[PDB]
Amino acid sequence: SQIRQNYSTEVEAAVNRLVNLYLRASYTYLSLGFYFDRDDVALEGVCHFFRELAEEKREGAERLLKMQNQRGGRALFQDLQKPSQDEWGTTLDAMKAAIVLEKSLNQALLDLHALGSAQADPHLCDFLESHFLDEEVKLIKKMGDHLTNIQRLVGSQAGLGEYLFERLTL
Template identity: 50%
Template sequence: MASQVRQNYHKDCEDAVNKQINVELYSSYVYLSMSSYFDWDDVALRHFAEFFKEQSHEEREHAEKLMEFQNKRGGRIILEDVKKPEQDEWSNGLEAMQRALQMEKNVNQSLLDLHKLSTENIDPH
């Protein structure tokens, strides 16, 4: 059944928002894994653990906001499997921070792609 509030919401944009939700949830998952690692008793880098836990919460909040947006636009949320982080141990904090930076760049590129797609489909929301 089609949503009664849906108006000028291109299917490609709806699909891209669902993809972005998954990107944000994956990032949250990776950050949570990093937080857990740095909280291990034999690693015990508390501030790294706290930092990555906060980043995990932030990424999840982004996913939740996109889910709210999807519902407001009359789209349907389709959650995908969140893949396991590629790495769950780190040689040091620098390596984890470098991975985090690369992940943030990937998330940002995905958002830029979403913006471009919505512009191409004349969807200013």
């Protein structure tokens, strides 16, 4: 590339892996969203919560693909693996799986930042810090807030607590 400057092949390969993780995450949140749209599940606020996260993960992947082109790297796309479950259980089981997914996206972002620091790439480190690291921490905190509230609700009787969390929080 005629524009590539201080952009190693190891960072370029790791950004392509992170694009695949964000696209896989968006595919999982899509599956989560239409599960809660089922007539025998019927939790509309839970559906809208996961459908918003599917758009955010897809826009995070497009933000990385735009950065890859701005630095002169080449995007390589892989197969998107299907989500790990077909049925997602309750709102508690779904939010638990969503926070495991966000923590693994956060850990992959931290391994890219540590790779960009060892390779001495200050533009990559500022790009992750401006758009990706702070939004992951905020989302993991909000999901942990939801998990604490769901677990204090579904202690007594699960169906009443699951309905009230969807109505009054989401």
